Curated annotation (Swiss-Prot):
Family per similarity comment: Belongs to the immunoglobulin superfamily. Contactin family.
Disulfide pattern: C25-C75, C119-C169, C222-C270, C312-C359
Species of origin: Mus musculus
Complexes and interactors: Interacts with PTPRG.
Protein name (record): Contactin-4
Function: Contactins mediate cell surface interactions during nervous system development. Has some neurite outgrowth-promoting activity. May be involved in synaptogenesis.
Domain Ig-like C2-type: 11-92, 97-182, 200-286, 291-375
Glycosylation sites: N40, N65, N166, N345, N350
UniProt subcellular location: Cell membrane; Secreted
Tissue-level expression: Expressed in the region of developing olfactory neurons. Isoform 2 is expressed in mature sensory cells of the vomeronasal neuroepithelium and at lower level in olfactory neuroepithelium.
Length: 378
């Protein structure tokens, strides 16, 4: 009996469909701690007004609207012995608007030429998925036709007499699962002559720097226009073998690296080749990791006039940075409070010091919170 608040469950980032929403957060402690919420930093008045339902800490919003709920939430729990704030949870809303036109100018191409048909997704939020339709049926993907999942563009390495007709981009919001269709774009062949042969020209490629988060699947795209139609090949610019766990898809337009690790980082190249020559694209897969607790602060009891020492340690990439909190408020160094980075030092203690403390570790990729109680003995 007699304990400050500790989190049993904290709020998580959310991408919510606009077609309910629960922000989980539960606390234990004695006395039973009261829970409050903060949007962008301002206390949310739950009893008034909405249909907010704070069920056991967890905030419910029973009918959402983007324009007024488009920020980051924080759950704060308080009892007699002090206050702890939870990690920040970003609340975003997903949607995909319709195209605002039903037809499109025809494009006229020389047979043998490479070409790009641009999707041009409508305003949206959340991750998108893409496919194309050709003359009423799904457009076939291969060596010569590549659809980018980053942009939705359709690439034809080499236009052939079989390619004449209508092309439609079908955009899909992967989180809401709604789809919208673009305007058909008519493709016709020039009758003025044909395009001869030329060396590959890479038109879709991974960026010059591609941040790769630890433990995720990194996907690289590479595809070239050319005549004859190029072959694609992947290799590392420092001669290191690509991992055996790496797979290739879509006639080698895509290199997947599952469960990314430090050893997989480095300069990657894709090579486009045909009989007329070769083209090389390169980029740097740069490894990064959100903070993770190595050493956390823990509850501490001390006698009235004695000293205390706390240290926080977090791994991550870049290396994490440290700030401190007392009872939910920014705590900076004074007397007898000496705080340097991940260290807190109280030279002599008084009843005033007893309370909840928090070490926060952050890098440009993430923040993490830890909390402990400091009780002082009569
Ligand atoms: C919170 O801030 C973001 C911009 O930083 C804004 O988009 C959002 O609407 C804000 N939340 C509200 C509704 O006050
Ligand atoms: C595409 O379809 C339209 C009808 O929607 C048709 O008139 C036209 O012949 C087709 N375009 C081409 C380039 O063949
Ligand atoms: C939220 O605000 C927008 C306009 O700012 C409006 O279109 C929508 O109907 C509103 N929804 C609610 C629940 O108030
Ligand atoms: C921290 O406490 C004080 C600074 O407030 C310092 O004199 C002392 O040596 C430090 N303690 C340790 C063990 O780091």
């Amino acid at each position: 009996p007699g304990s400050g608040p500790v989190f049993v469950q904290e709020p998580s980032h959310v991408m919510f469909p606009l077609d309910k929403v629960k922000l989980s957060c539960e606390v234990k402690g004695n006395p039973k701690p009261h829970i409050r919420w903060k949007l962008n930093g301002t206390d949310v008045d739950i009893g008034m007004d909405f249909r907010y339902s704070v069920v056991d800490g967890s905030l419910l919003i029973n009918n959402p609207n983007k324009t007024q709920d488009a920020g980051t939430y924080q759950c704060i729990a308080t009892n007699s012995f002090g206050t702890i704030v939870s990690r920040e949870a970003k609340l975003q809303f997903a949607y995909l608007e319709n195209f605002k036109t039903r037809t499109r100018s025809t494009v006229s191409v020389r047979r043998g030429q490479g070409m790009v048909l641009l999707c041009g997704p409508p305003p949206h939020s959340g991750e998108l998925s893409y496919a194309w339709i050709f003359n009423e049926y799904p457009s076939y993907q291969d060596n010569r036709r590549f659809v980018s999942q980053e942009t939705g563009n359709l690439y034809i390495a080499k236009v052939e007499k079989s390619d004449v007709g209508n092309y439609t981009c079908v955009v899909t919001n992967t989180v809401t699962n709604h789809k919208v269709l673009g305007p058909p774009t008519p493709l016709i062949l020039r009758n003025d002559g044909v395009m001869g042969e030329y060396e590959p020209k890479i038109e879709v490629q991974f960026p010059e720097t591609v941040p790769a988060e630890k433990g995720t699947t990194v996907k690289l795209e590479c595809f070239a226009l050319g005549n004859p139609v190029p072959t694609i090949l992947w290799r590392r610019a420092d001669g290191k073998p690509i991992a055996r766990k790496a797979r290739r898809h879509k006639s080698n337009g895509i290199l997947e690296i599952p469960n990314f690790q430090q050893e997989d980082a480095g300069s990657y190249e894709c090579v486009a080749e045909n009989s007329r020559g070769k083209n090389v694209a390169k980029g740097q897969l740069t490894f990064y990791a959100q903070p993770n607790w190595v050493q956390i602060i823990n509850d501490i009891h001390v006698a009235m006039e004695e000293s205390v020492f706390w240290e926080c340690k977090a791994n991550g990439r870049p290396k994490p940075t440290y700030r401190w909190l007392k009872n939910g408020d920014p705590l900076l160094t004074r007397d007898r409070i000496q705080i340097e980075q991940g260290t807190l030092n109280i030279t002599i203690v008084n009843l005033s010091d007893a309370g909840m403390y928090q070490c926060v570790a952050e890098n440009k990729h993430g923040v993490i919170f830890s909390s402990a109680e400091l009780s002082v003995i009569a």
